[PDB]
DNA sequence: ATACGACAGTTACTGTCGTA
DNA sequence: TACGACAGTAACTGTCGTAT
């Protein structure tokens, strides 16, 4: 059959580039195949590539392939070249010209490394596909994706040196302040997560207001424990508040849409027996949450926390008087 | 054991050795498996490697098959695929990850291991703020027909579980796929006129038809995408907003529509022209401005607004 | 020629369980 | 771990034809 051998030669790919070895669990997690069949694939890949090295990492053996597969399995396929540029174009069409420029550069190198003769062959079908699909563009402020602002910032955190720049807003606009670069979070605007000097909690800043950029030659590292994605998932979006358990009651009117809906990274989607759906999660940013609570109209009732009652009826009198409801 | 997967790759190993073509009458001997199964191996590789060509010397067949980027590139490709896997977009992620693999594979060691520790320094110095909305229903298979029928220019007979006529199959011209709230297939019910959009959630028991259905020479999927602000294609109203003086900054650098024009003021406000339908979806986006917005044109925007406002207004005791 | 199917019969497909 | 084995059960196999 075909389906069975596809997933094998894809695992051979997963090991051909790890360069440290993804252990049997880390090699069979991207497949969810199972233990013993994963080891059977280990021998099928050895019976495919007897140069595949096993290396220890007690308490486990990590496996890698050091010398590349056959070129048959390395030169990319149509849908993958296509899906690279549909996303790179999506960035170009979301004002994110730098994030795109990098992926475009990839595509260029990815095609000159294809033998010229074969490129012309499946150059067109790529274009057919990229035309055929399109990604939505929801409405949200233009991303402040300037390379010079991102050249200093992907390098301040590289040498782990500090950085001082001029920002506008907050309680004190204009203060050219020095901070601890952690990483950039791409969102509605573009935001940089960083910390002032020492002491406190990592504040928020919008790239749109960055001038006087220098790579402050005064090294300063972060708290080693900290992954930026963890700080990301704190809030329901951007605004960082006192993190809040929330629980929502969805009518049956929108039951089966609530099942496949995605509120937060910490969802608790278990259905009431009587048709409703109760959803609990935990994050800050309770106003942006009310904004998403418009989308459901009369199909959800804020049950807890009762701070959402305040924020919701707040924004329904804030946009209700200015429109002509009450 | 596990023979089926390993004995097959050794077929593509010779389809890359030939460059002139091997026939079933040969391959069935160079594998010792027999002809009727050799006739299935070709189909298998053709499903993996459409690059396999069939040089035909009458009256038999023959068969043959025909970098070093910056950390920045790799980390950006990675973070993209991750923001895909974090959205439920399984089909579009699975491919960006595969593309990272196939070029990591083709890198020499002392460099592929020299910049392997550098990728993740970046991959955790950025992460993308995934947004609330349904999981895009992307199953490799129920988009696989659609790609075949767009390449082969064929038609797509598919059952549909929604839209006032659910239960039986119906033919359309496969025109495009718009990835949005959910995932969408825009098609022409019949031919001529304007396109109607179908949610992929409710399309199953598809089949590509050997009755090739050609699309018009002059259709633009991005245009139709713009035709409705957001998703559902209402009438195209000429939309006209005024944003109060405060949120000019984000308005001036906002992106309401692809056919939008941001005209500033003198009194303090900002004037907004654009043109597309979707009154509900836009009343939603205008809730996220509060009271800095005065709807001018059309009149149905005001209505859809007050409709979907007091619907929650009496629902949440705020009125 | 090859594509291509139906149809008994077989022997790999899982997951689970054992010892050196 | 690197390893078989258990049936338990769906796919793999090859005789046999149809189909230009």
Q: Within 7 A of a protein CB, which nucleotides of strand D? A: 1-5, 11-16
Residues of A with Cβ-Cβ distance to B147 under 8 angstroms: 79, 129, 132
Judge if the beta carbon of B102 is closer than 7 A to nucleic acid strand C.
no
Q: Is the CB of B291 under 7 A from strand C?
A: no
Q: Cα angle vertex A27, ends A65, B78, to 5°?
A: 85
Closest alpha carbon to A24 in B31, A33, A16: A33
CA B281/CA B77 separation, integer angstroms: 31
Interchain contact, B109 vs A19, CB within 8 Å: yes
Q: Which residues pair with A191 in a beta bridge?
A: A185, A206
* CB contacts, 8 Å: B9 with chain A: 5, 8-9, 48
Neighbour tally for B291: CB within 10 Å: 15
> Which CATH number is associated with domain B153-216?
2.30.30
- Residue count of chain B: 319
Q: Which residue of A has its CA nearest to B53?
A: A121
How is residue A194 written in tokens?
A: 């960083």
Query: Residue A229, Cβ neighbours under 10 Å: how many?
Result: 17
Task: For residue A179, say if its preceding peptide bond is cis, omega within 30 degrees of 0.
Answer: no
| Phi, psi angles (nearest 5°) of residue A116 | -50, -45
Q: Give the separation between CA A21 and CA A199, rounded to whole angstroms.
A: 39
Question: What class does CATH assign to A244-318?
Answer: alpha beta
- Asked whether the beta carbons of residue B311 and residue A298 sit closer than 8 angstroms, the reply is yes
DSSP A225-277: T--HHHHHTTBSSS---S-EEEEEEE-GGGHHHHHTEE--TT-EEEE-TTS-E
Q: Is the CB of A14 inside 8 Å of chain B's CB atoms?
A: yes
Give Rg (Cα) of chain A.
Answer: 25
Is residue B195 a contact partner of residue B187, using CB atoms and an 8 Å limit?
yes
**A35 nearest nucleotide via C1' and CA:** C15
* CA nearest to B45 within chain A: A2
Asked if A35 reaches chain B (Cβ–Cβ under 8 Å), the answer is no
Cβ contacts of B247 on chain A, cutoff 8 Å: none
Give dist(CA A295, CA B287) in Å, integer: 10
Distance CA A209, CA A165 (A): 9
The set of residues, in sequence order, having a beta carbon less than 8 Å from that of B179 and lying 6+ positions away, is: A133, A134, A135, A136, B89, B92, B136
Pairing label, strands A261-262, B133-134: antiparallel
The CATH code that applies to domain A3-72 is: 1.10.10.10
**Set of chain A residues whose Cβ sits within 8 Å of the Cβ of B88:** 262
Cβ atoms < 10 Å from Cβ of A117: 8
SS3 B99: helix
C-beta of residue B108 within 8 angstroms of C-beta of residue B62: no
**Residue B54 contacts residue B61 (beta carbons within 8 Å):** yes
Q: How far apart are CA B182 and CA B31, in angstroms?
A: 47
d(CA B154, CA B251): 44
**Residue B185: φ, ψ to 5°:** -115, 115
Helices (H) and strands (E) in chain B, counts: 12, 11
Q: How was this structure determined?
A: X-ray
Q: Nearest Cα to A320, choosing from B272, B300, B243, B308?
A: B308
Helices A286-294 + B300-313 axis angle, to 10: 110
Is B181 touching A (CB cutoff 8 A)?
yes
Q: Is A34 left (phi over 0), alpha (psi -120 to 50) or beta?
A: left
Nucleotides of chain C touched by protein CB (<7 A):
1-5, 12-17
* Ranges of each domain in chain B: 1-66, 71-123, 153-216, 238-313
The CB density around residue A272, as the number of other CB atoms within 10 Å, is 12
Which tokens hold the place of B290?
Answer: 């509060």
Give residues preceding each break in chain A, C–N over 2.5 A.
none
| Exposed/middle/buried for residue B14 (C-beta within 10 Å: 0-12, 13-18, 19+) | middle
Asked if B70 is an interface residue toward chain A (Cβ–Cβ < 8 A), one would say yes
Alpha carbons B11 and B41: distance in angstroms, whole number: 8
Question: What are B194-198's contacts with CB under 8 Å, separation 24+?
Answer: B194/B233, B195/B219, B195/B224, B195/B233, B196/B233, B197/B231, B197/B232, B197/B233, B198/B160, B198/B163, B198/B172
Phi and psi at residue B207, in whole multiples of 5°? -165, 135
Listing DSSP states for B177-224 in one string gives EEESSSEEEEEESSSSS--EEEEGGGEEEEEEESS--PPPTT--HHHH
How far is residue A155's CA from residue A136's CA, in Å, rounded to a whole number? 32
Count of alpha carbons within 13 angstroms of residue B266, beta-carbon side? 0
**With an 8 Å Cβ cutoff, are A13 and B105 in contact?**
yes
User: Would you state the structure tokens that stand for residue A151, as one six-digit string?
Assistant: 């050249």
| Chain A 228-257, residues with CB within 8 Å of chain B CB atoms | 228-229, 232, 236-238, 257
Structure tokens at A236: 């329901």
Examine residue A305 and say whether the peptide bond preceding it is cis (omega within 30 degrees of 0): yes
**Cα A144 versus chain centre, distance:** 18
CB–CB contact A9 B48 (8 Å):
yes
> What's the CA–C1' distance between A14 and C2, in Å?
38
Which of B134, B287, B317 shows the shortest C-beta gap to A319?
Answer: B287
Cα A12 to Cα A49: distance, rounded to the nearest angstrom: 9
Across the interface, which of A187, A293, A313 has its CB nearest the CB of B129? A187
Instruction: Give me the CA B16–C1' C9 separation in Å, rounded.
Output: 35
Rounded Cα distance, B75 and A158, in Å: 13
The span from the CA of B16 to the CA of A4, in Å, is 21
> In whole angstroms, how large is the CA radius of gyration of chain B?
27
Say if the Cβ atoms of B290 and A322 lie within 8 Å.
yes
Distance of alpha carbon B172 from its chain centroid, rounded? 19
Q: What's the CA gap between A161 and A248, in Å, rounded? A: 44
- By CB neighbour count within 10 A (0-12 exposed, 13-18 middle, 19+ buried), where does B263 fall? exposed
Helix axes B279-287, A286-294, angle to 10 degrees: 160
Q: Resolution, rounded to a tenth of an Å? A: 3.5
A6 closest CA partner among A62, A73, A51: A73
> How far apart are the C-alpha atoms of A89 and B275, rounded to whole Å?
23
Look-up of token digits 């179908």? B198
Asked if strand C comes closer than 7 Å to B33 Cβ, the answer is no
Please list every residue in chain A whose beta carbon sits closer than 8 Å to the beta carbon of residue B222: 134
Q: Give every CB contact of residue A159 below 8 A, 6+ residues apart in sequence.
A: A215, A219
How crowded is residue A40: how many other Cβ atoms within 10 Å of its Cβ?
17
- DSSP secondary structure of A79-113: HHHHHHHHHHHHHHTTT-HHHHHHHHHHHHHHHHT
- Give the bridge partners for A164, in sequence order: A178, A214
Q: CATH code for B1-66?
A: 1.10.10
Q: Tell me if B257 sits within 8 A of B275, measured CB to CB.
A: yes
Q: Is B317 an 8 Å CB contact of chain A?
A: yes
Do the Cβ atoms of B96 and B84 come closer than 8 Å? yes
Contact in structure between A235 and A262 (CB atoms under 8 Å) = no
Going by the DSSP 8-state scheme, the letter that residue A209 receives in this structure is: G
**What count of other Cβ atoms lies within 10 Å of the Cβ of residue B214?**
10
How many Å does it take to go from CA A59 to C1' D1? 10
Are residues A102 and B72 in contact, defined by beta-carbon separation less than 8 angstroms? Answer: yes
List beta partners, residue A262. B133
- The H or E element containing residue A313 is helix A307-318
| Beta-carbon separation of B96 and A87 below 8 A | yes
A127 in contact with chain B, both atoms CB, cutoff 8 A: no
**Nearest-Cα residue of chain B relative to residue A45:** B6
Residues 6+ apart with CB under 8 A from B220: none
Q: Spell out the alpha helix ranges (H) of B106-156.
A: 109-112, 116-123, 144-151
Distance CA B178, CA B219 (A): 14
Q: Which residues of A touch B86 (CB under 8 A)?
A: 265
Q: Contact B158/B167 with Cβ under 8 angstroms?
A: no
What kind and span of H or E run contains B307?
A: helix B300-313
Q: Could you give the C-alpha distances from B277 to A218, A233, B194, B228, in angstroms and in order? A: 54, 34, 14, 5
Tell me which residue of A312, A321, A253 sits closest to B315, measured CA to CA: A312
- Whether B100 contacts chain A with CB within 8 A: yes
C-alpha triplet B256, B257, B262: angle, nearest 5°: 65
What is the 3 state secondary structure string of B251-280? Answer: HHCCCCCCCCEEEECCCCCEEEEEECECHH
Q: Which nucleotide is nearest to B36 (CA to C1')?
A: D14
Q: Which residue among A139, A309, A318 sits closest to B255, beta carbon to beta carbon?
A: A139
Give the torsion sign (CA, B33, B34, B37, B43): positive
- Distance CA(B103)–CA(A113), nearest Å, equals 10
B61 is near strand C: CB distance < 7 Å: yes
Q: Is A322's CB within 8 Å of B112's CB? A: no
Q: What H or E segment, with its residue span, contains residue B249?
A: helix B249-252
Measured between alpha carbons, how far is A61 from A55 in angstroms, rounded to an integer?
6
Q: How far is CA B283 from CA B110, B156, B304, in A?
A: 56, 35, 7
Which residues have CB under 8 Å from B18's CB, separation 6+? B62, B63, B64, B65
Query: Can you say whether the dihedral through the CA atoms of B185, B190, B191, B195 is positive or negative?
Result: negative
Query: For residue B82, what are its two tokens?
Result: 């991750």
Q: Give contacts of B 128-147 with A, CB under 8 A.
A: 128-135, 137, 147
Residue B294 — φ and ψ, nearest 5°? -120, 105
Q: Are B83 and B97 in contact (CB under 8 A)?
A: no
Q: Which of A146, A134, A121 is nearest to A85 (CA)?
A: A134
Q: Where are the alpha helices (DSSP H) in A93-236?
A: 97-112, 116-121, 124-132, 147-151, 153-156, 228-232
Q: Which residues, in sequence order, are bridge partners of residue A270?
A: A278
The answer to whether B316 contacts chain A (CB < 8 Å) is yes
Contacts of residue B318, defined as CB under 8 A and 6 or more positions apart, other chains included, come to A312, A313, A316, A317, A320, A326, B312
**Cα dihedral value A102, A86, B45, B140, nearest 10:** 120
At residue A231, what are phi and psi to the nearest 5 degrees? -60, -35
């Amino acid at each position: 059959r075909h389906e069975k051998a596809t997933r094998l030669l894809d695992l051979a790919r997963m090991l051909a580039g790890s360069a440290e070895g993804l252990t049997l669990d880390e090699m069979a997690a991207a497949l969810g195949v199972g233990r013993r069949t994963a080891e059977r694939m280990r021998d099928a890949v050895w019976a495919a590539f007897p140069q595949m090295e096993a290396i220890d990492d007690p308490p486990t053996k990590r496996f890698r392939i050091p010398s590349g597969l056959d070129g048959v399995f390395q030169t990319p396929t149509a849908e993958e070249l296509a899906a690279l540029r549909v996303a790179a174009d999506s960035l170009r069409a979301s004002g994110a010209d730098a994030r795109a420029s990098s992926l475009y550069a990839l595509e260029a190198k990815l095609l000159s490394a294809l033998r010229g003769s074969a490129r012309r062959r499946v150059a067109p079908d790529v274009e057919a596909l990229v035309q055929a699909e399109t990604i939505a563009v929801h409405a949200g402020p233009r991303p402040y994706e300037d390379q010079a602002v991102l050249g200093a910032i992907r390098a301040a955190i590289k040498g782990l040196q500090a950085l001082s720049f001029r920002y506008e807003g907050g309680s004190t606009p204009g203060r050219t302040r020095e901070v601890t670069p952690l990483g950039v979070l791409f969102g509605r605007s573009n935001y940089l997560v960083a910390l002032e000097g020492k002491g406190g909690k990592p504040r928020s800043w919008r790239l749109d207001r960055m001038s006087d950029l220098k790579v402050l030659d005064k090294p300063a590292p972060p708290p080693q424990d900290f992954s930026l994605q963890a700080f990301a998932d704190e809030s329901f979006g951007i605004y960082h508040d006192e993190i809040q358990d929330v629980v929502l009651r969805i009518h049956k009117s929108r039951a089966e849409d609530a099942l496949r809906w995605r509120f937060h990274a910490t969802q608790q989607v278990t259905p009431e027996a009587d048709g409703s759906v109760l959803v609990t999660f935990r994050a800050g940013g309770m106003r942006e949450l009310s904004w998403h609570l418009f989308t459901w109209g009369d199909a959800v009732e804020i049950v807890a926390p009762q701070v959402l009652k305040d924020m919701m009826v707040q924004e329904l009198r804030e946009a209700g008087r200015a429109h002509g409801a009450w």
